[PDB]
A = this chain, B = another copy of it.
């Protein structure tokens, strides 16, 4: 149901800006994600650019921005880091600690200095004080959950032509094309306990609850900004049970709280999935086994009035799950872990519905249109369990 929205953000939160993974080797991670996701390299900051502290590669597709960063070892001169908050020692420990993982969830805000200030005044634990990067660009960080930080980035609307962040050199893509992913939809974190994680996070941002799924194996709650275009869910495990909670399994292998999955939206998910799946065999990402025709007979009954046989067929061929909503239709699919451990994975989706306008010809879509796959949980759990037992 639609939960009330008290529009209580403590600072103006515009939208997701980017995500940064602190890696063992940026070249490797960025390189694989670039062809695996169809996100050409767009900016860079490394030795070739005068940064001898860290190597950073920014991949982009539509409005999706993925930053991959790794520390140099010797001859490293910290003062040359394009990202002032970088810590070689911290990064090195991060990589050994979790393998491939998300370090920063960055949101564009009206003013990074005021967002930090209002955040710390409301309990946020500071991670990196506000600094100017140049051209009206500001950055600040506070602790989100575990060793993941919530990063604030602000700049004049007129500076949006910047490749990424000051200090980053733009990279052109002439012999390059994307697969259709356009934006981050939601970023989910796993914590040992929801309430305290939620109280701290909602308490310093003013973000409100948009949705919740409670019980197997987990309790989830989605937090959103005023306009609800920024969605940050949190999961906690449910103890006891039969098999170990999939949430606990992550905390165990990951070694603590962290980003579990990131949902990436496409406006034509079928075209996008075909491109990704064509790359699976040679280093790309793999997807969860497609459900069986029974599941799909069910989608014909559940939503045969929005998808066409040739579409539902495509869905079954790729392994896409389909959910219906009081006001929208959701197509979603999950990849297998993108790193060495069964921790971080990706979700690819497309939302159908909830379109409206704002005195302009551009028709915007309501955030979270179609839900989060509540109807598919049953199947998702069965696919996960089966694969689990399959791993014995």
Contact = CB atoms under 8 A, between A and B. Distances in A.
Contact of A55 (B41, B70, B340): B340
Contacts of A255: 73-74
Contacts of A382: none
Contacts of A96: 24, 71, 73, 92, 95-96
A130 interface: no
A300 to B, nearest CB: 29
Interface stretch (A28-36, A184-192, A309-317, A362-370): A28-36
A173 interface: yes
Contacts of A337: 27
A281 B176 contact: yes
B25 A100 contact: yes
A257 interface: no
Contacts of A340: 25-27, 46, 55, 70, 72
A280 B97 CA distance: 31
Given A28-B23, A100-B28, A35 B283 contact: yes
Contacts of A176: 281-282
Given A27-B339, A73-B99, A281 B48 contact: no
Interface residues of A, number: 57
Given A95-B96, A96-B95, A339-B28, A73 B253 contact: yes
A100 B48 CA distance: 18
A290 interface: no
Nearest to A285: B31
A32 B283 CA distance: 6
Interface of A: 23-36, 38, 40-41, 46-48, 50, 55, 70-75, 92, 95-100, 173-176, 252-255, 279-284, 337-342, 391-392
How many subunits of this chain does the assembly comprise?
A: 2
B75 A252 contact: yes
A225 B44 CA distance: 43
A319 to B, nearest CB: 15
Contacts of A55: 340-341
B284 A391 contact: no
A255 to B, nearest CB: 4
Given A31-B32, A339-B27, A73 B92 contact: no
Contact of A34 (B24, B95, B252, B283): B283
Nearest to A99: B25
B40 A282 contact: yes
A74 B342 CA distance: 11
A33 to B, nearest CB: 7
A117 to B, nearest CB: 35
A95 B25 contact: yes
A47 to B, nearest CB: 7
Contacts of A41: 283
B254 A74 contact: yes
B33 A283 contact: yes
Contacts of A32: 27-29, 31-32, 35, 283
Given A28-B25, A47-B341, A96-B92, A281 B40 contact: yes
- Which 10 residue pairs spanning A and B have beta carbons closest together? A24-B24, A34-B283, A31-B283, A35-B283, A175-B281, A31-B32, A28-B28, A55-B340, A24-B25, A28-B29
